[PDB]
């Protein structure tokens, strides 16, 4: 509900909690996952080790029903 | 005009072709669609099996 | 110009006939809202496109 949101509390305060120096611009740093091997590499390496590259072989037209074998313990 | 058109319709009764103003004006598509007999025509092959195996009236007891 | 086609002359006739104030008895009808001719045109004010 809108009456519980913090925007109601920011009324009367210029910059709406986004700061005066940094101004809530459109897309600083890029959209989506831009700069994964660049300015966002520090994040993409601290979290998500293994984001980039290939591992293993491919299976064209994988039919998941071939591998149906749910297990139960004694 | 009404009397003249009534007389003309009487004259053109049982005639194959009658003037366009006397012909019924339903709709272009309605006038162009197939006649009832032509649309209901079926093949002899269909007619035989329709005669000998139609949808029956049946019930299934519980 | 003095040289006119029949179509142009006819349209000028129609414009001239439309150039008039509204009848007085119109304003006396029940529910009337027309105060004046809002589509009035003058040869010095608004140019008609043929």
């Amino acid at each position: 509900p809108t009456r519980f949101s913090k925007t109601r509390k920011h009324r009367g305060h210029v910059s709406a909690g986004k700061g005066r120096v940094g101004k809530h611009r459109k897309h600083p740093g890029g959209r989506g996952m831009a700069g994964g091997q660049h300015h966002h590499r520090t994040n993409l390496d601290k979290y998500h080790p293994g984001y980039f590259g290939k591992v293993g072989m491919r299976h064209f037209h994988l039919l998941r029903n071939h591998y149906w074998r749910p297990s139960i313990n004694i | 005009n009404a009397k003249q058109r009534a007389q003309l319709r009487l004259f053109y009764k049982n005639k194959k072709y009658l003037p366009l103003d006397l012909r019924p004006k339903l709709t272009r598509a309605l006038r162009r669609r197939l006649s009832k007999e032509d649309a209901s025509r079926v093949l002899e092959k269909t007619k035989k099996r329709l005669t000998h195996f139609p949808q029956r009236k049946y019930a299934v007891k519980a | 110009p003095s040289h006119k086609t029949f179509r142009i002359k006819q349209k000028l006739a129609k414009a001239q006939k439309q150039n008039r104030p509204i009848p007085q008895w119109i304003r006396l009808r029940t529910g009337n809202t027309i105060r004046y001719n809002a589509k009035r045109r003058h040869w010095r004010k608004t140019r008609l496109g043929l």
Binding site: - | A2, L26, T27 | R7, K11, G49, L50
Partner: protein, 86 residues
């Protein structure tokens, strides 16, 4: 250019179109800039929704098309009410 050149404006690029009635018939090309006359199809473009709706069906009299729904509702019947003078 400007005021002095505007004084030479005493010719007509466009005249009245016979099909749409607008003063958009190019006098030399003999083609209407609005309705596309004399082409058989009426000029219409999907990048001008306003232009399309200015002349779509329903902006005129609909002399014949307005009577079709009633005739359909009554089934395109013919004849006269059982018991009518004539």
């Amino acid at each position: 250019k400007g005021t002095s050149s505007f004084g030479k404006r005493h010719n007509k690029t466009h005249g009245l179109c016979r099909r749409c009635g607008r003063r958009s018939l190019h006098n030399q090309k003999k083609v209407c800039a609005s309705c596309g006359y004399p082409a058989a199809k009426t000029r219409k473009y999907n990048w001008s929704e306003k232009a399309k709706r200015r002349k779509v069906t329903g902006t005129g009299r609909m002399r014949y098309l307005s009577t079709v729904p009633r005739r359909f509702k009554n089934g395109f019947r013919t004849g006269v009410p059982k018991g009518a003078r004539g």
